[PDB]
Amino acid sequence: TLEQKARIKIDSLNGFIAEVESLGKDALKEKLAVRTAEVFLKFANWDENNIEENKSHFEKYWLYKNVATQMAQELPDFERNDILKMLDESIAYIKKIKKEEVFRAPIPKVDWSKVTVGQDEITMDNNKPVFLADYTWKPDTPELTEFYGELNGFYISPYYVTNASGKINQNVINNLNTKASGTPGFVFINNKNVPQWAIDSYGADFTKFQGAPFLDYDIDHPGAKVMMSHLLKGTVTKMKGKHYTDLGYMLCNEPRWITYKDGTKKVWYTSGVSTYTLDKFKGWLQNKHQNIAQLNALWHSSFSNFEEVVIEIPIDISLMGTPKWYDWVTFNEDRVTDWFTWMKSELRKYDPTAKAQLKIMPSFFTENDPATGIDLEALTELSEINGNDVAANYNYMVKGEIVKDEKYAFGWKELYMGYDFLKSVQPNQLIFNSESHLLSTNNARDLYMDPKYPRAVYWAAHTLGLNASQTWYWPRKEDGSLKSGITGAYAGSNNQQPRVTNALHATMMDLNTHSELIMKMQRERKPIRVFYSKAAAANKGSYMEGVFEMYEGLNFEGIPLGFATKNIISKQDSSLWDVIVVHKTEQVTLGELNTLQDYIDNGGTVITDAISLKKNEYGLPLEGLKQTKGKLILANTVAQAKIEALQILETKNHLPKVTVTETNAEGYKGCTWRCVKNEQGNYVLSIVNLGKTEATLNVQLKQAKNGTVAKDLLNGLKLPSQLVLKPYDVYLIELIDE
């Protein structure tokens, strides 16, 4: 039987591990293989005995609905055979280790008990930087914490305020009194299960208006603060300085305040707003317009004063582009930011050192979701840790079928644009993906997913700033059964994927081995900033297609990309970059325009196309920019702006000191790369093939005295002049002058 073969493989592998370590080499990756094999052998025996439960889970996901029986029946032998391939791959490699056909540096073993969470790095002893990985709901057992992480945490919810005097649930106080510091983790603030006293006191209106589906109450109702203050006051002083606050206080799980309509189509999570919200909107309208006639001309309204302003919320999406749509969506962003400005300062009263963060989805930003109320920049400014749960799309499920990315190996835009924006707003802060959806999500899933994919995307995520991650997800219990509450997200995901799970932590050991090189790419200057306007975004649903168009054209030059905004220019040192590129940003506020002028007035360079920067948020004409002491370069096409932008770096001497030229059968580059200098002063490249076909790379130094010879840092060999990259392939190489 397959399991009997597998235990034979395990026996041979363990034997090889022992021999290699006796010769003084490191076999920690292969030890991860064996454990992953043991664990999933257990998973598969439970599957075999629970076809009916597994069939019901496969019925919950549309891709597998019609073959649920088939999938549940075949799952145990899928997992077992995946385990065999895993053991074979490891057995072969540990023989190359034994025979010295490869040289792999000892992998550091991350003891979570001996790691320190800094401002922009996590480090273990010896001050070696490290990167942390765990899973959502993984069991806390020795079997799993040895390789799959030891993330700590604490969970609070307004349901713990048991009366209106602010008494906290006693079993929670007992737990908080006896829970030790423990390993590093984060505080989860639930915003559901409003307690009965709040309902009784504040009435039906208190929960009629929601930040659905993860906040169940009216953030603008005065009771909202009374309730949240009670919870924070009664628990947080017990948490101050505990290691389970090291990765912050998560103020909200996937926040959003969706407030638009679409005729008779169902808009998920949308809500109206209370009288309290309209009262703040009126105040906001007073500050924005000054007098009612100005608002009335833009709204085509005829209010006599601001107290008489009326707006229908949810506001229909057909109004997008109108002044009234801009005012609502912008105010909605601001009022949500106000709630978290309040929530943070209340938190600080009880833990003055608290690091705020949110589990924000950056896809609202990269996909330009309408009327969400989420100002990604403004909530990231208020955070000490760059929280998020960004995703990537191995595929796209359309109407219950798999569709692949039309252009690349997988959908990476959300990760690269997302994290580059996070690291432009908070360049000196850690990234903590507290519910990583790089493996699977609502519309991305494949039981048979190629194990090269988790490697590429987690490697990519870490070059971009990722420092710690809780990966979605590990719903399996200790004995291999499943937690109750299994939804459609389960079928096909990582708890049915031995080699996908193996790849993840095996890629983490590569990342940790060479973590100093990764931190150099995370800290690298970002000389080119693509401009982003919330005003353009509010007005044009398709706005982020033109933005990605510019970003995409720049993202394969060995340069880490960044963004610029009004606040980034107003608040940060312009010497941190060389040029700002504007592309297809047709509407901006006057504050945005003048800040871009201030940047040129003080010696900066702006590349823009002719169509941008000439209408305001209401569609009224703006003067655009002028060249003064700095420079203004006009360039309509992505190709021209790319030529102009790279020249500015050339002048300022900020181009990579390495060139990479790529052949592929696609007509565009798909190998994205990074270049930094190591301690011996040799240049090191990280390369990921994002393209859907094989790429040949000619890599050369710029000042080579003898030549350019590349060495594989992962396995210690010299590589051929023409590097070949299959889709998803990952290279970490050092360039030598020979």
- Chain-centre distance of CA 377, in angstroms? 14
Neighbours of 481 (CB within 10 A): 15
Q: How is residue 439 written in tokens?
A: 């493996």
| Half-sphere exposure at residue 488, Cβ-oriented, CA atoms within 13 angstroms | 14
CA distance 522 to 386: 13
| Half-sphere exposure at residue 249, Cβ-oriented, CA atoms within 13 angstroms | 27
CA distance 121 to 433: 14
| CB-based contact 558:612 (threshold 8 Å) | no
* Domain boundary assignment for the chain: 2-99, 528-652, 658-737
CA distance 31 to 26: 10
Beta strands 431-436 and 115-117 are unpaired
Name the percent of the chain in helix, strand, coil, to the closest 5.
45, 20, 40
Q: How is residue 292 written in tokens?
A: 């009612």
Instruction: Return the CATH architecture of domain 528-652.
Output: 3-Layer(aba) Sandwich (3.40)
Same fold across 528-652 and 658-737: no
Backbone angles phi, psi at 159, to 5 degrees: -65, -15
Three-state SS at 671: strand
Q: What is the DSSP letter of 607?
A: E
373-410 core/surface letters (b: 16 or more CB in 10 A; e: else): bbbbbbbbebbbbbbbbbbbbbbebeeeeeeebeebbb
- Chain-centre distance of CA 308, in angstroms? 42
Beta strands 658-663 and 671-677 are unpaired
Beta strands 658-663 and 695-701 are antiparallel
**E runs forming strands in 245-399:** 249-253, 260-261, 315-316, 356-359, 386-388, 396-398
Three-state SS at 402: strand
The secondary structure of 165-221, three-state, reads CCCECHHHHHHHHHCCCCCCEEEEECECCCCHHHHHHHCHHHCCCCECCCECCCCCC
Please count the helices (runs of H) and the strands (runs of E) in the chain.
23, 27
DSSP string, 33-88: HHHHHHHHHHHHHHHHT-HHHHHHHHHTSHHHHTTHHHHHHHHHHHHHHHHHHHHH
| CB-based contact 578:530 (threshold 8 Å) | no
Q: What is the DSSP letter of 704?
A: -
Three-state SS at 98: helix
Which bin fits 587, alpha (ψ -120 to 50), beta or left (φ > 0)? Answer: beta
CATH topology of domain 658-737: Immunoglobulin-like (2.60.40)
CA distance 637 to 549: 10
CA–CA distances in Å: residue 661 to residues 73, 221, 613, 668, 669: 48, 58, 35, 11, 9
Neighbours of 314 (CB within 10 A): 17
- Chain-centre distance of CA 633, in angstroms? 33
Neighbours of 278 (CB within 10 A): 18
Q: Which residues is the chain interrupted after (C–N above 2.5 Å)? A: none
The secondary structure of 451-502, three-state, reads CHHHHHHHHHHHHCCEEEEEECCCCECCCCCECCCCCCCCCCCHHHCHHHHH
Host H or E run for residue 433:
strand 431-436
Neighbours of 73 (CB within 10 A): 15
Q: How is residue 699 written in tokens?
A: 């890599």
User: Which residues fall within 8 angstroms of residue 152, CB to CB, at 6 or more apart?
Assistant: 182, 183, 184, 185, 186, 243, 244, 246
Closest listed residue to residue 239, CA positions, set 138, 349, 112, 117: 349
Closest listed residue to residue 365, CA positions, set 532, 567, 131: 532
- Chain-centre distance of CA 287, in angstroms? 35
CA distance 634 to 651: 18
Neighbours of 108 (CB within 10 A): 18
| CB-based contact 527:560 (threshold 8 Å) | no
User: Which residues fall within 8 angstroms of residue 638, CB to CB, at 6 or more apart?
Assistant: 549, 550, 552, 553, 583
Cα-Cα-Cα-Cα torsion 377, 381, 384, 388, nearest 10 degrees, comes to -10
Q: What is the DSSP letter of 106?
A: P
CA–CA distances in Å: residue 233 to residues 226, 230, 340, 347: 10, 5, 16, 8
326-362 core/surface letters (b: 16 or more CB in 10 A; e: else): bbbbbbbbbbbbebbbebbebbeebbeebbbbbbbbb
Place of tokens 């790089």: 438
| CB-based contact 521:164 (threshold 8 Å) | no
Resolution (A): 2.0
| CB-based contact 671:691 (threshold 8 Å) | yes
**E runs forming strands in 190-328:** 249-253, 260-261, 315-316
| CB-based contact 568:424 (threshold 8 Å) | yes
User: Which residues fall within 8 angstroms of residue 400, CB to CB, at 6 or more apart?
Assistant: 62, 63, 65
Q: What is the DSSP letter of 647?
A: H
Put the strands of the sheet holding 658-663 in their side by side order.
Answer: 658-663, 695-701, 722-725
Amino acid at the residue 638: V
Q: What is the DSSP letter of 623?
A: -
Backbone angles phi, psi at 187, to 5 degrees: -95, 125
| CB-based contact 550:530 (threshold 8 Å) | yes
Closest listed residue to residue 112, CA positions, set 17, 37, 181, 177: 181
CA–CA distances in Å: residue 29 to residues 34, 348, 369, 518, 689: 9, 42, 41, 19, 23
| CB-based contact 188:157 (threshold 8 Å) | no
Torsional sign, CA 255, 257, 262, 267: positive
Backbone angles phi, psi at 572, to 5 degrees: -120, 160
Q: What is the DSSP letter of 718?
A: B
Amino acid at the residue 480: G
CA distance 270 to 372: 9
